[PDB]
Short mmCIF file of C-alpha atoms and ligand atoms in Angstrom, two decimals:
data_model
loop_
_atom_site.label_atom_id
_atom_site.label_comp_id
_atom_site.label_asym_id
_atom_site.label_seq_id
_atom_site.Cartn_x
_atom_site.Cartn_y
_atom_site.Cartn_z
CA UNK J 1 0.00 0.00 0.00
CA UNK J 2 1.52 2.98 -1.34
CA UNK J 3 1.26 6.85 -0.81
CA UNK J 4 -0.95 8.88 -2.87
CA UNK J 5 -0.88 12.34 -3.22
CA UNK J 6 -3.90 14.86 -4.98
CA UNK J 7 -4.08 17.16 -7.19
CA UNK J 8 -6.87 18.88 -9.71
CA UNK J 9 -6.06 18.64 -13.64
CA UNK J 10 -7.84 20.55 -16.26
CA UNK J 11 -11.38 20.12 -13.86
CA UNK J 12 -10.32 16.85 -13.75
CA UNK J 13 -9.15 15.47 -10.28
CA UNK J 14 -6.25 12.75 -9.72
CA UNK J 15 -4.98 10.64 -6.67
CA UNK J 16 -1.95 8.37 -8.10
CA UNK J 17 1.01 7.28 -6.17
CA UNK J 18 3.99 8.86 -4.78
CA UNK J 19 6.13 6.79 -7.92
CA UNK J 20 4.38 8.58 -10.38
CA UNK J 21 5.25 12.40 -10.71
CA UNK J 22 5.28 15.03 -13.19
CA UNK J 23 1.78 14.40 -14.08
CA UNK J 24 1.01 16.44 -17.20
CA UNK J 25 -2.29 16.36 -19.14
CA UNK J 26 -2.03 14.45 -22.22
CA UNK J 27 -5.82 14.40 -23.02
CA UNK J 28 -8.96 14.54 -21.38
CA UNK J 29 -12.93 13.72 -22.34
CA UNK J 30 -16.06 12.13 -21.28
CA UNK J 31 -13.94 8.73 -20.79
CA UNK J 32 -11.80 10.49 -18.22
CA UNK J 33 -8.56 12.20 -18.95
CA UNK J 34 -4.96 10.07 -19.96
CA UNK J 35 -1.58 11.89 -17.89
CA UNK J 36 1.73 11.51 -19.01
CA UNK J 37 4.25 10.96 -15.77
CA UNK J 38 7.82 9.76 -14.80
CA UNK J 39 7.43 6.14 -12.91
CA UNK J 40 9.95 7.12 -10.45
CA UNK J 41 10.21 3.10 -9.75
CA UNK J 42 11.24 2.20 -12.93
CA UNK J 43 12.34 5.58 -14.22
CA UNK J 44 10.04 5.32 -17.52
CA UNK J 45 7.91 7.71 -19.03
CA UNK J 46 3.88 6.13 -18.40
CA UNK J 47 0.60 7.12 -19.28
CA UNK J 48 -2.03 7.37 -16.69
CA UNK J 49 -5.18 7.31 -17.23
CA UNK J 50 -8.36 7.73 -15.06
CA UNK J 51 -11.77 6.43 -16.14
CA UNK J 52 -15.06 8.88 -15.27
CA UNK J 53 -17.56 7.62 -14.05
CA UNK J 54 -16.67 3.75 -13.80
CA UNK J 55 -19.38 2.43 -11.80
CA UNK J 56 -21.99 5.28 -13.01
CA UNK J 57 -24.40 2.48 -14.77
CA UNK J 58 -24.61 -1.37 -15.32
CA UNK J 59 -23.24 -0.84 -18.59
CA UNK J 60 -20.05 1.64 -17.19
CA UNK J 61 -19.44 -0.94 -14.96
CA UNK J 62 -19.59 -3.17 -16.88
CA UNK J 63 -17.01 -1.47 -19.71
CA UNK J 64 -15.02 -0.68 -16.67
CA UNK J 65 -14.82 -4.80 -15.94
CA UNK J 66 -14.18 -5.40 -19.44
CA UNK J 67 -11.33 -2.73 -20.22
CA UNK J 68 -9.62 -4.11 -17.27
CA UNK J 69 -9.90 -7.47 -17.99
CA UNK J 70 -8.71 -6.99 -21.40
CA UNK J 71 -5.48 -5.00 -20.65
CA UNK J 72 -5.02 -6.99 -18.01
CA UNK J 73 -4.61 -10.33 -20.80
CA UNK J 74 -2.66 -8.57 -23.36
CA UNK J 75 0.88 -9.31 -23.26
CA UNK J 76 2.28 -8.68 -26.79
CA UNK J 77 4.90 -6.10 -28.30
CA UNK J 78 2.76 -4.61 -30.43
CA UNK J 79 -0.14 -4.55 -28.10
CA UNK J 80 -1.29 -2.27 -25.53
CA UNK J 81 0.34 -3.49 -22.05
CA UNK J 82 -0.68 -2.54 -18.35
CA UNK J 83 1.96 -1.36 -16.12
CA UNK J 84 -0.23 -1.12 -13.59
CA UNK J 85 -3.42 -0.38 -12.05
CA UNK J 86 -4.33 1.07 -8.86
CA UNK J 87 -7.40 2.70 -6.99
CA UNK J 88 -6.96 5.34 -3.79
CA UNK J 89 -9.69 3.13 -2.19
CA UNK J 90 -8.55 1.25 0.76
CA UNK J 91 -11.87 -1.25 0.59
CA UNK J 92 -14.51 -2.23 -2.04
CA UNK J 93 -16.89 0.02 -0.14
CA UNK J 94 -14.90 2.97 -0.92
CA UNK J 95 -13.86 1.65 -4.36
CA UNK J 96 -15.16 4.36 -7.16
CA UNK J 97 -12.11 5.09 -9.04
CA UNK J 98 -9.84 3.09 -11.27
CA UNK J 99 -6.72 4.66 -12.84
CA UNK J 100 -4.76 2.71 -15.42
CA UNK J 101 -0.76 2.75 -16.42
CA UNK J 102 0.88 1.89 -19.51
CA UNK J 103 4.26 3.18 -21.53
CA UNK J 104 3.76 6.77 -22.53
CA UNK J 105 3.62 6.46 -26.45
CA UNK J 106 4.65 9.54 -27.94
CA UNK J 107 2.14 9.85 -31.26
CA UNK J 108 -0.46 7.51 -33.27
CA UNK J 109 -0.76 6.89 -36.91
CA UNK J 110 -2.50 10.30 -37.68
CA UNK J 111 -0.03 12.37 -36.09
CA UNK J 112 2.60 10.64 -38.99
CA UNK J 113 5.76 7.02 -45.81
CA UNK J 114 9.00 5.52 -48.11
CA UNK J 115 7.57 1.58 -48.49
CA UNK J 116 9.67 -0.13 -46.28
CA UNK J 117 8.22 2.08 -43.76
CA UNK J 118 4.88 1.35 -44.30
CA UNK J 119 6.20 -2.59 -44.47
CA UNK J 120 7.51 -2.31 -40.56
CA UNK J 121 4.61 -0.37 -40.11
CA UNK J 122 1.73 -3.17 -41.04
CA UNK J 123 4.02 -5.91 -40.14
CA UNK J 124 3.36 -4.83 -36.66
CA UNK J 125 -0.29 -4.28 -36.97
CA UNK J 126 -0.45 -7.88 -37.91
CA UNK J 127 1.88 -9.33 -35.55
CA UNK J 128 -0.51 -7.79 -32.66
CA UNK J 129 -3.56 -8.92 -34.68
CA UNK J 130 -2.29 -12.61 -35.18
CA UNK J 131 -1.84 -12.43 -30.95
CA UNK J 132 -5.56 -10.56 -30.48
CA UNK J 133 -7.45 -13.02 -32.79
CA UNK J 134 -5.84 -16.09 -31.41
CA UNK J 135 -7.29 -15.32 -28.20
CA UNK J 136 -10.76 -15.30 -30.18
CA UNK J 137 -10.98 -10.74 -29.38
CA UNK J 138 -11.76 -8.92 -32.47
CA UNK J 139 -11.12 -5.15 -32.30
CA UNK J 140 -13.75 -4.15 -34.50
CA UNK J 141 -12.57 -0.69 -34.35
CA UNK J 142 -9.08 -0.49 -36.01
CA UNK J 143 -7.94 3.50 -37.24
CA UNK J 144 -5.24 5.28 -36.75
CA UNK J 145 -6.21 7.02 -33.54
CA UNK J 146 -5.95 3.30 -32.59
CA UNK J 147 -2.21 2.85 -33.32
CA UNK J 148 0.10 3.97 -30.89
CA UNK J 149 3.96 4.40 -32.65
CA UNK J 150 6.81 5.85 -30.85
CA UNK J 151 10.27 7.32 -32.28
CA UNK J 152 11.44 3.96 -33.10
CA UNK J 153 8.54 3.57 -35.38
CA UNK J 154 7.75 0.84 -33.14
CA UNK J 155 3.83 0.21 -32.86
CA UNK J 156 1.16 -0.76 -30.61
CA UNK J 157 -2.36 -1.80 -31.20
CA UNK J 158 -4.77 -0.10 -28.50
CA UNK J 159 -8.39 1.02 -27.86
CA UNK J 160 -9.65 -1.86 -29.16
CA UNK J 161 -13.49 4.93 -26.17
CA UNK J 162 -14.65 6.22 -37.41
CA UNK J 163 -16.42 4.06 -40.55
CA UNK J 164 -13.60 5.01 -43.38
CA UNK J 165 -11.68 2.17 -42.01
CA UNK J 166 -14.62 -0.16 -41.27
CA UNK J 167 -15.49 -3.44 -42.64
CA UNK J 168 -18.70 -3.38 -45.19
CA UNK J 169 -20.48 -6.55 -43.61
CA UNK J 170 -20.19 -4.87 -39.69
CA UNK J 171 -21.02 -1.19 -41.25
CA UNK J 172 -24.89 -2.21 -41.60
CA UNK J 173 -24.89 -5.17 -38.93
CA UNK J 174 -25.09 -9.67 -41.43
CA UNK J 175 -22.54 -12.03 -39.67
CA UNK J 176 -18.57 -11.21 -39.28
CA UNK J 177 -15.49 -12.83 -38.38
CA UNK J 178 -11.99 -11.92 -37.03
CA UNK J 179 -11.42 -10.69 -40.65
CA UNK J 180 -13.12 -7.32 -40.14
CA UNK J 181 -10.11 -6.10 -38.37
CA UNK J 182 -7.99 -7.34 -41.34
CA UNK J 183 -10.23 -5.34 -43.57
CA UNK J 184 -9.47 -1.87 -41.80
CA UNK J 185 -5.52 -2.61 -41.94
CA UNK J 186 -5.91 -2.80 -45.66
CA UNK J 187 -7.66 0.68 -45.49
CA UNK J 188 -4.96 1.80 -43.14
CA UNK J 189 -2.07 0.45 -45.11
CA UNK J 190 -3.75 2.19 -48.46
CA UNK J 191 -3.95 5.17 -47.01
CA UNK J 192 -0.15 5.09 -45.86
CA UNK J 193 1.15 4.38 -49.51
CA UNK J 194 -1.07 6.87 -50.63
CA UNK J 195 -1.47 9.68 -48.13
CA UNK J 196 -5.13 10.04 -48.89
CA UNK J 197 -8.44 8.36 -46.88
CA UNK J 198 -9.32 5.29 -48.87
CA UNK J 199 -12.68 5.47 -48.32
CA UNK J 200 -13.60 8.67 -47.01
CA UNK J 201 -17.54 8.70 -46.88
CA UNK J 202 -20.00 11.30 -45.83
CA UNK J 203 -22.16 8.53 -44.07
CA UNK J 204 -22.30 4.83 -43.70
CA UNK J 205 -24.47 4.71 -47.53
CA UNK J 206 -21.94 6.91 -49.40
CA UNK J 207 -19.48 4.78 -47.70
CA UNK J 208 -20.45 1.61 -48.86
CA UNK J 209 -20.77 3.05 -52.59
CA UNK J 210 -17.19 4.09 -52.12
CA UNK J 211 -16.27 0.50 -51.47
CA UNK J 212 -17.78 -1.25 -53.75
CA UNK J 213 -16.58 1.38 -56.51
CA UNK J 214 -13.32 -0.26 -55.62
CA UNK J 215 -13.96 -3.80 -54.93
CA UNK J 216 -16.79 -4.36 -57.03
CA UNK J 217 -19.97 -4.98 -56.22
CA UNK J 218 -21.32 -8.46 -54.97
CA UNK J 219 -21.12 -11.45 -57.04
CA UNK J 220 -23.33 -14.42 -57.08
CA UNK J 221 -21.36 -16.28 -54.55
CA UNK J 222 -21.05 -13.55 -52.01
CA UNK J 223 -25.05 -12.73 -53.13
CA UNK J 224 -26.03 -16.48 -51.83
CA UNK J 225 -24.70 -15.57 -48.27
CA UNK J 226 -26.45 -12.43 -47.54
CA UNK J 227 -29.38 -13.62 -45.09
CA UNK J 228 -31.04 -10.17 -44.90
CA UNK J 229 -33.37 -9.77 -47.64
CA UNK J 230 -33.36 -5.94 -47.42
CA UNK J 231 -29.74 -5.50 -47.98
CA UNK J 232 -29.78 -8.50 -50.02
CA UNK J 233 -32.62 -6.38 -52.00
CA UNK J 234 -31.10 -3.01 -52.05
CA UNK J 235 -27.00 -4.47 -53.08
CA UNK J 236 -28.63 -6.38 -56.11
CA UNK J 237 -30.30 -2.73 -57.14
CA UNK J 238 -27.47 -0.90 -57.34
CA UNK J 239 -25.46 -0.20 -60.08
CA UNK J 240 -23.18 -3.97 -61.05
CA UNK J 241 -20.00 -2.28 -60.57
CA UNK J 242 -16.73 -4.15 -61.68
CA UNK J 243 -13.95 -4.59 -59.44
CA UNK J 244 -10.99 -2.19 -60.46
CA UNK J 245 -7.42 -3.47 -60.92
CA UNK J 246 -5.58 -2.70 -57.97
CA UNK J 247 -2.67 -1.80 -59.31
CA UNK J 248 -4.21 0.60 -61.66
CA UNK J 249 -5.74 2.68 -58.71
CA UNK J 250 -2.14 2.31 -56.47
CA UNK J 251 -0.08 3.02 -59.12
CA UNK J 252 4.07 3.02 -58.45
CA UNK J 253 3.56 1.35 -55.38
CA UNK J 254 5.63 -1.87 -54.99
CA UNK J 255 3.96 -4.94 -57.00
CA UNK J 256 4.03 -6.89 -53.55
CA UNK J 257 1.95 -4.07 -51.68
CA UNK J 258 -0.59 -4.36 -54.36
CA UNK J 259 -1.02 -8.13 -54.07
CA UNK J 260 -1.58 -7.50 -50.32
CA UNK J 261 -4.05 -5.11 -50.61
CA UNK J 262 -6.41 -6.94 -52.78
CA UNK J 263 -5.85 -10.32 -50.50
CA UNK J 264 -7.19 -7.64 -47.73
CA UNK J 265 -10.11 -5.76 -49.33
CA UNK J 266 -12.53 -8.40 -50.45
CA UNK J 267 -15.92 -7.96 -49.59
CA UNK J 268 -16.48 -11.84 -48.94
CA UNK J 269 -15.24 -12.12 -45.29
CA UNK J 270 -14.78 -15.76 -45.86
CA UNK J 271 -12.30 -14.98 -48.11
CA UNK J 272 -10.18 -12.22 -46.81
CA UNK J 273 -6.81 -13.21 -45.73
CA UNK J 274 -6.01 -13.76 -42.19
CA UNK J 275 -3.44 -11.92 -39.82
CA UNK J 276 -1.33 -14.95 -39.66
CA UNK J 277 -2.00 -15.72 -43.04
CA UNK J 278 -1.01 -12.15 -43.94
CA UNK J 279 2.40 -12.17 -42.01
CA UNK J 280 3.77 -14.75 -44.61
CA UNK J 281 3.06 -12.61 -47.12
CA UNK J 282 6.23 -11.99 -49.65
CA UNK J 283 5.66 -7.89 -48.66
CA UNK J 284 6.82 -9.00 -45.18
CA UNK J 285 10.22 -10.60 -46.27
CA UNK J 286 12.67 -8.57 -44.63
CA UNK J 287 10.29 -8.89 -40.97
CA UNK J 288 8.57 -12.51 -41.07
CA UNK J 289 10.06 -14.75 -38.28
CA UNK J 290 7.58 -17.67 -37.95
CA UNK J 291 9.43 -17.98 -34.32
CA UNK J 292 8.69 -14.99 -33.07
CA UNK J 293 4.92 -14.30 -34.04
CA UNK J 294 3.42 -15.37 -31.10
CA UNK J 295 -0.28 -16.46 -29.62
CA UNK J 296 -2.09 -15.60 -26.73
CA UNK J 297 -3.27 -17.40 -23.80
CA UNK J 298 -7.12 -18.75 -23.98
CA UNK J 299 -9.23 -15.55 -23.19
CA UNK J 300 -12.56 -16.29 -21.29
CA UNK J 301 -15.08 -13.92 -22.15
CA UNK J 302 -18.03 -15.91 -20.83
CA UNK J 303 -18.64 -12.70 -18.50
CA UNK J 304 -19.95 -10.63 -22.05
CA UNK J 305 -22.98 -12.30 -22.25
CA UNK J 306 -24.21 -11.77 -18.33
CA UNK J 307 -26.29 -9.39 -16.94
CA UNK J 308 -25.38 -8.12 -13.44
CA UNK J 309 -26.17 -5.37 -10.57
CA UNK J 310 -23.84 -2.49 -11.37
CA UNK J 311 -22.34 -3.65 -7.50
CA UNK J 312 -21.42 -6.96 -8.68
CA UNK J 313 -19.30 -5.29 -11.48
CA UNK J 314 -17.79 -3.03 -9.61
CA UNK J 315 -17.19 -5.79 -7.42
CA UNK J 316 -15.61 -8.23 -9.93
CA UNK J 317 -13.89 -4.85 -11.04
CA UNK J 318 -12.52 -4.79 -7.62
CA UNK J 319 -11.13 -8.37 -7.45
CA UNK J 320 -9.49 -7.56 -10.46
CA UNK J 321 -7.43 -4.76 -9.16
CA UNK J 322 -6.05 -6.72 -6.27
CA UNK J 323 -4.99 -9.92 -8.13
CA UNK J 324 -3.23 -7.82 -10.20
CA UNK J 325 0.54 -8.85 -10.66
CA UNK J 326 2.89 -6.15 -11.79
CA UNK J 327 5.13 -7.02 -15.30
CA UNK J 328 8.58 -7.69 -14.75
CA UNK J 329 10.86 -3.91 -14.99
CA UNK J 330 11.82 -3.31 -18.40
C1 SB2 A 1 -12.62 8.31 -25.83
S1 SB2 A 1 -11.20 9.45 -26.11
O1 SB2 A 1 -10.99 9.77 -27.68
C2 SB2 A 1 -9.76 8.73 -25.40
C3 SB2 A 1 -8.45 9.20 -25.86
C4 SB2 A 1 -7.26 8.61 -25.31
C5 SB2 A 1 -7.32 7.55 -24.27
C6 SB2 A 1 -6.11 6.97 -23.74
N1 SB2 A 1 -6.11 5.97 -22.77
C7 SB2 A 1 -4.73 5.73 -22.58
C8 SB2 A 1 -4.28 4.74 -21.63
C9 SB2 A 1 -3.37 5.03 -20.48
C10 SB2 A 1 -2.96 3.97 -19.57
C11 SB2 A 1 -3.45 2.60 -19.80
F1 SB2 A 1 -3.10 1.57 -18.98
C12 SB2 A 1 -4.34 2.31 -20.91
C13 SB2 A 1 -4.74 3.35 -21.81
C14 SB2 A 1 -3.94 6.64 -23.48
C15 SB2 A 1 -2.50 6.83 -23.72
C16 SB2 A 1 -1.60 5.62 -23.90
C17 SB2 A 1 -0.19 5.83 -24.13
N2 SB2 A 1 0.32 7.12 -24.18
C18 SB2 A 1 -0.43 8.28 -24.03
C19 SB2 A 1 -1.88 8.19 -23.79
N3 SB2 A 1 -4.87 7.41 -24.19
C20 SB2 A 1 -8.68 7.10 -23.83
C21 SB2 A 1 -9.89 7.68 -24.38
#
């Protein structure tokens, strides 16, 4: 049990531990607020972030329990990692707030491409990916806001609080696999040979027609899988688009890139290439080590499809916090 010490940022209050110091306002918003700070332990530069609200609702609480949970499992380079996690509450009773630590990651893929950049870049994206889907966690909302990438140009998948980069089939809610995530890292990695939005539409209907501009639009196989009959209805009226050559809309970009991309943008989920898949992909040459693409433990996520009294999250919350075992100093 540690000593914590106040103090109010931007309207936002903050009791963290005498280790961390220097705490300087990297963000703030309905979520909470995220603080940079010097881990006086370890002498890294962290990220602290306090949630708002945790325990406001059933379903806060419940988001509380499952961000925990998650970054509590993730153990992975190129993932998101927690550092720690702490509360000033001495008793579940008392228990209301729940502040967070990770590495302080100095900007994300918007803030920042020659090709073998954008090769190291991806390569990452799916190396975290392979680990996340293994574990059976889709992150559904890939962008990147989403991609942490420090000086290095070392990168970190994160989240897992918008539609350019999302996947048609979870855009207008038939069935989906792990492969929507792979879908937005194709619209990421486009937009990084390219410098421009792949898909940049005004709404989720203009979206779409941007897509299938590109991809085509459904063929008779892809047709017989559609179980709504509205979409089914309004796809099959819409202008039958053909699917462009790839490498006539990325132009000069290397052959290999190309390839990728259209293994990566196919409309029929059951046919998109997969993370791991992806990683022994000829673009990843110079990166691809078989040995050192790693898996993640079994995940149990059982606890999604439960409904409990915002108490009993916040209790299960709670437990959380105190079996918490800290990572070994890096
Ligand atoms: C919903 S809003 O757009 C929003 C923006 C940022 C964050 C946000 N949460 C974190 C953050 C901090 C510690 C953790 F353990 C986990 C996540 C960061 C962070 C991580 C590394 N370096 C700097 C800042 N940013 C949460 C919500």
């Amino acid at each position: 049990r540690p000593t914590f010490y106040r103090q109010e940022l931007n309207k936002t209050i903050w009791e963290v531990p005498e280790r961390y110091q220097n705490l300087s306002p990297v963000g703030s918003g309905a979520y909470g607020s995220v603080c940079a700070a010097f881990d006086t332990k370890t002498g890294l530069r962290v990220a602290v972030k306090k949630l708002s609200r945790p325990f406001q609702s059933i379903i806060h609480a419940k988001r509380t329990y499952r961000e925990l949970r998650l970054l509590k499992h993730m153990k992975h380079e190129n993932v998101i990692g927690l550092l720690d996690v702490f509360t000033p509450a001495r008793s579940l009773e008392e228990f209301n707030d729940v502040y967070l630590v990770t590495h302080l990651m100095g900007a994300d893929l918007n803030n920042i491409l020659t090709d073998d950049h954008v090769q190291f870049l991806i390569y990452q994206i799916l190396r975290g990916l392979k680990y996340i889907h293994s574990a059976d966690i889709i992150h559904r909302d890939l962008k990147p806001s989403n991609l942490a990438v420090n000086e290095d140009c070392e990168l970190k998948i994160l989240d897992f609080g918008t539609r350019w980069y999302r996947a048609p089939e979870i855009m207008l809610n038939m069935h989906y696999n792990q492969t929507v995530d792979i879908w937005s890292v194709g619209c990421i990695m486009a937009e990084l040979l390219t410098g421009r939005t792949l898909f940049p539409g005004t709404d989720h209907i203009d979206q779409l027609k941007l897509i299938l501009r590109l991809v085509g639009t459904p063929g008779a196989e892809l047709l017989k899988k559609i179980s709504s009959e509205s979409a089914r209805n309004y796809i099959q009226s819409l202008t039958q688009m053909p699917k462009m050559n790839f490498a006539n809309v990325f132009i000069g970009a290397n052959p290999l890139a190309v390839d990728l991309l259209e293994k990566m943008l196919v409309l029929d989920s059951d046919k998109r290439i997969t993370a791991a898949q992806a990683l022994a992909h000829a673009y990843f040459a110079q990166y691809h080590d078989p040995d050192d693409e790693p898996v993640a433990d079994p995940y149990d996520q059982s606890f999604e499809s439960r409904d409990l009294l915002i108490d009993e999250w916040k209790s299960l919350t709670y437990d959380e916090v105190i079996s918490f075992v800290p990572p070994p100093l890096d």
